[PDB]
Amino acid sequence: VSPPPPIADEPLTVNTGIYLIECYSLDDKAETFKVNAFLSLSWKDRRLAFDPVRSGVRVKTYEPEAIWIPEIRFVNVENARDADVVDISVSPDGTVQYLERFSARVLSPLDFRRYPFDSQTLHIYLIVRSVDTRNIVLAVDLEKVGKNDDVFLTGWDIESFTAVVKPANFALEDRLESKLDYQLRISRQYFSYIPNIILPWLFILFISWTAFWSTSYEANVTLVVSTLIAHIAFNILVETNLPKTPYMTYTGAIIFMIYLFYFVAVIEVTVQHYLKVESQPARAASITRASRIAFPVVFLLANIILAFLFF
Amino acid sequence: VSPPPPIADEPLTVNTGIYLIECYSLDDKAETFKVNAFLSLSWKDRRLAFDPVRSGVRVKTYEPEAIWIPEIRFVNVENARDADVVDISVSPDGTVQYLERFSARVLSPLDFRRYPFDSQTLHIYLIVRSVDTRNIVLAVDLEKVGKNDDVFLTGWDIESFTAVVKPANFALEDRLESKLDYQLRISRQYFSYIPNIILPWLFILFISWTAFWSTSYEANVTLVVSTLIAHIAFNILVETNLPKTPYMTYTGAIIFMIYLFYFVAVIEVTVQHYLKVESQPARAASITRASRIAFPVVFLLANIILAFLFF
Amino acid sequence: VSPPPPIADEPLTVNTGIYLIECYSLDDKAETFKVNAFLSLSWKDRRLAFDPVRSGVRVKTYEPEAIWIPEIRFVNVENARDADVVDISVSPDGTVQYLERFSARVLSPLDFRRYPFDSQTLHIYLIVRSVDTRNIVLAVDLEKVGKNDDVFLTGWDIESFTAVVKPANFALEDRLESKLDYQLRISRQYFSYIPNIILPWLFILFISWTAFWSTSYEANVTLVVSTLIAHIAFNILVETNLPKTPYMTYTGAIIFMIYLFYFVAVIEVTVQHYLKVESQPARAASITRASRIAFPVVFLLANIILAFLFF
Amino acid sequence: VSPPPPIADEPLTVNTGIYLIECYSLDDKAETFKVNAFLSLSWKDRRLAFDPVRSGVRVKTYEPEAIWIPEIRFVNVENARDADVVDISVSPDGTVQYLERFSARVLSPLDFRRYPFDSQTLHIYLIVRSVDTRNIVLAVDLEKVGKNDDVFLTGWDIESFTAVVKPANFALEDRLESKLDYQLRISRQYFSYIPNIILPWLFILFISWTAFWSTSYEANVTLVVSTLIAHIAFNILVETNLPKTPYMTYTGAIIFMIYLFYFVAVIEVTVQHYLKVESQPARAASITRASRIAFPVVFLLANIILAFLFF
Amino acid sequence: VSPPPPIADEPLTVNTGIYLIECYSLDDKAETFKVNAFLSLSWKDRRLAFDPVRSGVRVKTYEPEAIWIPEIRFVNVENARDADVVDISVSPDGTVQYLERFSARVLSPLDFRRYPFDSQTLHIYLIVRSVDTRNIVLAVDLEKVGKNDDVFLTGWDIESFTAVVKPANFALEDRLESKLDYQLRISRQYFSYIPNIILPWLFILFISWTAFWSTSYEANVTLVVSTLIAHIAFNILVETNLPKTPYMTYTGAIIFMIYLFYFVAVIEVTVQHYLKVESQPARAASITRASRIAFPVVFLLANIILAFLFF
Ligand SMILES: CC(C)c1cccc(C(C)C)c1O
Ligand SMILES: CC(C)c1cccc(C(C)C)c1O
Ligand SMILES: CC(C)c1cccc(C(C)C)c1O
Ligand SMILES: CC(C)c1cccc(C(C)C)c1O
Ligand SMILES: [Cl-]
Ligand SMILES: [Cl-]
Ligand SMILES: [Cl-]
Ligand SMILES: [Cl-]
Ligand SMILES: [Cl-]
Ligand SMILES: [Cl-]
Ligand SMILES: [Cl-]
Ligand code: NA
C-alpha cells in the first residue's frame, strides 16, 4: 500500500468530519476535556475504482489493512485516540468513505478572566503529514460535522460545534502539514454559584460589619477575626478548583478585595478602641458611624468598578 | 466475511440481552457507574446453516474471526467495553447465538433535585450502524435480560433492570442506526444521612439558638459565629460529594436557608445588644423573647414548605 | 480445538487451586482488594493421552493455543485478570496440569457493624460456563490452595485462605455454570486506633466537661463550643475512611452519641447561666453539681449498652 | 523450544543482575516504590553452541521467540513488569547473555518505628519455577548488579543496592523454586521536618503554656483550647502521610504525649480557677507557679525517655 | 534483521531530533512532566540501496518490522513511550528517515530553592545501546529539534528547547552507550502568588500586630492566637504543593520566620499582661510601644536578609 497517484500535479484532499457522541470530564485546573466521537474521512483513490454494471455491487467494502488510509492525528491530545473502525465503503469512481469511532483526552486552554460567568471555545485540531509521493490537504465536509442532542457537559451549556473550513497548511521538519480547527463553544452554568458560594460569602462578610454597631472591642475582635477564618475557608475552596493564572480573574479580584475589607475593618476596630481607651468616644463613635455607611457603599461601588473592568 | 444476504428485502434483526454480573463505582459527581455484564446476541445467517443428519452434530461452534458478527457498540460509554467472547453457537437453521462478557464505565446523568431521598434511572444504550448491503435492526430477547441476585450497588437499592423493547431507529451520517435503551432503576439508601449529617447539623443550629436565652453579647457572638464555622464545615462536606447543578436541589435549598437563619440570628444578636447599650432592655428582651419562638417556628414551617415543593 | 469427549455421560471435573503470592490495596470505602496469585487447573483430556514407554518422556509440555483449555473466569472482579501462563504439563493418562500467575482487583463487600474491632471474610469466586458438547463442573484440589507466609495486608491479620469444596452448580441463560467460593478471613489491627483516635477524642470531650467546675458563661461557651469544633474535625476524619452504610455501625453510634452529649452540655451551660442571671444560684449550682457526676456516669453506662448491643 | 538438557544430573544456573536506571514514587502509606531497571540473565544452552572458525562470527544474536529463555518473575510486584528486550547474545560455548529493560511497582513493607529518622531496606525478589525436564536455580552475577549515579529517590538518601548471593530454594506446588533477594538500602532526609513540622509544633505548644503566667480563666481557656485546635490540625497532617501501624511509632508516641500535656494543662487551668472562685489564690498561684517549671521539665524528660526507648 | 555492516571500522551515527507538539502536567511534588512530541531518527543502511529507474520510485517506504531500526530509549522516563510510527522513508543511497510521534511522562528533578520566583531546566535523555556487530553513536540534527508555537505549560513560561550536540558516550555492562541531553528551560509565572497568597497572609500577620495598640489581654490572646490558625491554614496550603526538600527553600524560610514572629508576639502579649497584673503599666506600655516599631522593622530587615541570601 502507497498513496494514490495524482491525475495532474494537484494535492490529495481528505474530507474530515467529527460528530460528537459523548462530551464529558471537563477538568478546569488541568484545562482538559474527554470526548467520544465519530471521525469521518473521504478521499479519491482511482486505483480502487470499479465498473458498477460489471461488478454488480454499487459499493465495495474493505478491511483497513487492505487499502491505503491517510495517517490522520490530533494535535492537542494527551495520548493517541482509542479508535475503532466502523466502516470503509468504496464508490465506483474510487471515492473512499472511512468512518471510525474514537475517544481522546483533549488539551484545550481556558480563559478564567470572567469566571464563573465565563464562556469557552474548546479546540480539536486534526492534522495530516504529507508523504514524499504527493501532498495531503485536509477539508471540512460540513454535512458530517456535528453533535448528538443528548451530549451533555456537566455545569456547561453547549452552544455550537463548528469547524474552520480553511486548513492551516504549513511546513514542519521539511514536509507539508494540513491542520484543521474544530471549535466547541461552551458557556458556564453560573446558577449554583449564587446560593452556594456568592450569597453565603456576602452573609459572612455582613456579619463582620455588625462590629460597626458595637463598642465592645472583645466582641468586635471575635466578630472580624472569626469571620476572616470563614473567608479563608471559602477562598481556599474556590482557588482549588481554579488553576494558577498569570492574569487577574474576576473572582480573584473580588477575593483579594474582601481580604482588604477585612484588613481595613480590623484597622477601624483597632482605631475605635484606641480612642475609647484614650478617653475620646466622640471621635470613636463618629468614625464608627461613618464606617456603617462607608464599608457597604465603597464595597458596592468597587464591585461595579470591577464588573465593568471585566465585562 | 460480509453480512448475510436477505431472503426478500427485510432488515436483519439482532436479538440483544444484557445480564448484569457486577454493578459498582457509582460516581455521583462524575455521573458514571461501572458494570460487568453478559451481552447476548442472536441473528439468522443462512450461509452458516447445515443438515444435522449428515454433519452428525446438532450444534456448530465458531471462532469470532471465522464468521460475520454484527458491530454492536454502546452509546453512553467513556471508552470501548473490555469484552471477552464466552461462546458462539450455530443451530442447523443458521441461527447464531453469541455471548460475551464485558466491563464498561457507563455515562448516565443523575437528577439530584430530591437528594438524598432521590431515585435514579440509569441507562445503557446499545447501538448498531446498518451496512450498505442490508439494514441492521436491534431487538430485545426478554429471556436473556436480567441481573444476578448478589449484584450490589453500595448505598443504593436496585429496583429493576428492564429494556425498552422498541428500538429508536434513526438516520446518522447517511446510514441507519438502531438504538436500544437498557434501564436500571435505583433508589438511594438515606439511612446513614440522618444520624451522620442531618441530626448533628440540627444540633449545631440549635446550639446557635441558645443566644435567645442570653443577654451577654460577647457570649452570643461566640455562640452564633462559632456555630457558623461548624455550619460552613458541614456545607463544604456535602457540596463536595455533589456536582454543580443548574437547578436547585432539596439539600442546597436547606443549606442556603440555614445560612439565612445564621445571618438573621446575627442581626437579632446585634439589635438586642444595641438596645441594651442604648438603655432600653424592655425592647431588647421583648425582641429576644419573640425570637425564642419565631426562629424554630419559621424554620419548621419553611422546611414543610420546601419538602412540599420538592416531594 | 474442542472439549474432550465424555466417557459415558459424566461431566468434566476441573481441579482448581488458588495460591496467594501478594495481597494488597484493601480499599474499605470501595469494598475492593487487589491480589497477585497462582491459579492451578487440572482436567482429563483422553485425546492428549500417550504411552510413556515408547515416547520415552513421562510428561509432555504444550503451548496454550495447542490444546483445549477451559474458559475459567472470576465473578467478583472489576476487569479480567492479568494472567501469565507459567506451565502446562500432560501426564500419560491425559491429565493436564495448568498453572498461571494472575493479578485482579476483587469486589468483596465488607461489614462495618463492629468497626474498628471488625473481622471480614473476603470472597474470590471462580466460574465456568458449560459448553454444548458437555457440562463443565469445578472442584477444589486442597493441595494447591493456600498463601505464602510473607503475604501481608497492611492493618489486617490474615487468618485463613480456604475454599468451599462443593461448587454452586446453577442454570444461567440456558446453560450450566459451576461456581466456587474462595474465602480469605481477615481481622482488623485495632491498636493504632486507641492512642491516635479513641483517646484524643475522649480528651477533647473531657475538656468540654470542665464547664461543670465553672460559673463563667463566657468561658463555658468558649469551652463547650470550641471542643465541638474538635469533635466535628475528628467525626469528619473517620466517616471519610468509611462508606455510607444502610446499617448503624459501632463507631457511628458513639459518634452520634457524643453529638448528643455536646448538645445536652450546651443546654446545661444555658440553664446554669439563665438561673444565675435570674438570681437563683442555689438551683444553678445544684444542677451543675449533678452534671459533674451525671455526664461521665451516663456516658460510661451508654457505652456499655452500645458495646453489648454490638458485641 | 524446551529447556537445555543436563550434561550430568546438575541443575541449570541462571546468572541474574539488576541495574537501576530510575528509582521513584516511594508511597509510604501504600508501602510501594516504582523502579525502571536493566535485568541481565545468563545460562548455558549447549544446543546453541557453535564453532567460531566455521561460522565466521564470534557471537550470534537471536530473537526472543527463536531460543529457550527462562521464565523469570518478580515476587513482590503489583502486576507483571513492563519489559522490553534490549539484547540476546550467544557465545561459541552456548552461553546466552540476555538483557531487558523493565519497569515495575514493587511492594516492599516499611518500618515506621523510628519515623522520620527511620532507614529502610527495600526488597526486589527474583524467582524461577523449575520445569519437569530439569531444575532451575538462580545466581547473582555481582558484575551486573548496581545503579546509575543520577538515580534519585525524592526525600531519601540511597545507601546501597546489593543482592543476597545465596538463593532461597524451596518447594511450591510440587515444584522447585529459586528465589533471590535484591536489597536497596535507603535512609530518610529528616531536614525539612525540623523547620516545617517539629519547631512550629513546639511553638504552638509553648503558646499554650503561657497560661501559667495568667490568672484570667477566660484568656486561659482561649489559650489552651485554641492551641489544641492547632495541635489537632498538625496531628491530622502527619497521620495522613503514615499508614495504620499495629506497632507504636516514634512520632505517634510524641503525638499522643502532647494530647496528654493539653489535657493536664486544661485540668491545671480548671483547678487554678476553681480555687480562685473558692477564695484561696495562695493555693492557686502555688500550683500555677509549680506548673511553670513542671510542664517543660516533665516534657523534656519524657522526650529523652521516648528517644531512648526508640533509638 | 541485523545492524548495517560498516564500510570501514567507523561507528553508526544516528541523527536524533525531538519536536514538542504538547507539553503539559508538570507535577511539582512528583518532579514529572508529560510530553507529546515528534522523534526523528536518521542513519545510513547501505543494504537498503535501490536504483530508482528499476524500482520506479525516488523514495521507498517501509513498515517498521521490514527493516533494521535502532533501539532508541529514553533514560528519565516512568514507562516506555507511547510511540506511533508516522513515516519511514529510504533514499537510493540507503539513508533512512524515521519519524514517530510519542508521549511519555518524563522524570526531571526541580530546584525549589527560589520558589515561586524559580526557573527550571527540564531534561529528556535519549540513549542507544551499541550492538556486538558495531557501535551506535547518537547525533543532534538541529534542523529537526524544536517546539510548536502553541506549546503551553500552565503557570510557566517556556524559554528554550535546545540539545547538547556532543553525546555522552560511556561504558555500561560491558557495552557502549551513547546518551543525548535535550534541555527544556522554563521559568515560573509568579503573578497569581502575590494577590492570592503573599498579600492575604501579610494582611493576617498585620491583624495580629494590632495587639500592640491594645492593653486587653483577653482581646490580644483572641487576636494573636486566631491569626495563628489562619497562618497554619496558609502554611499547610503551600507545603502540600511542594515536595520534602533536604535543602531550605525561599518560601520555607519565610514560612518558618512568620512562626517565630507569632511566638515572639505571644511572649510580648504575655509579658505586657504580666507587668500590668504586677502593677507596673509604665514598663508594659514602654515594651508595647517599642514592639509597635520593632515587629515591622525587624520583619522588613529579616526579609531583605532572606531575599539577599536566596537571590
Ligand atoms: C467561584 C464563584 C462561586 C465565585 C465566588 C466568589 C465571587 C465570585 C464572583 C461574583 C466575583 C465568584 O464567581
Ligand atoms: C444531603 C444531606 C447530607 C442533607 C444535608 C442537609 C439537609 C438535609 C435534609 C435533612 C434537609 C440533608 O438530607
Ligand atoms: C474510626 C475510629 C478512629 C474510631 C472512632 C471512634 C470510635 C471507635 C470505636 C471504639 C468504635 C473507632 O475505632
Ligand atoms: C508559596 C508562596 C505563595 C509564598 C508563600 C509565602 C511567602 C512567599 C514569599 C513572599 C517568600 C511565597 O512566595
Ligand atoms: Cl491522535
Ligand atoms: Cl462500546
Ligand atoms: Cl476473570
Ligand atoms: Cl513479574
Ligand atoms: Cl520446602
Ligand atoms: Cl521439581
Ligand atoms: Cl523510552
Ligand atoms: Na492500511
Ligand code: NA
Ligand atoms: Na467476524
Ligand code: NA
Ligand atoms: Na486453547
Ligand code: NA
Ligand atoms: Na523463548
Ligand code: NA
Ligand atoms: Na526493525
Ligand code: NA
Ligand atoms: Na473568645
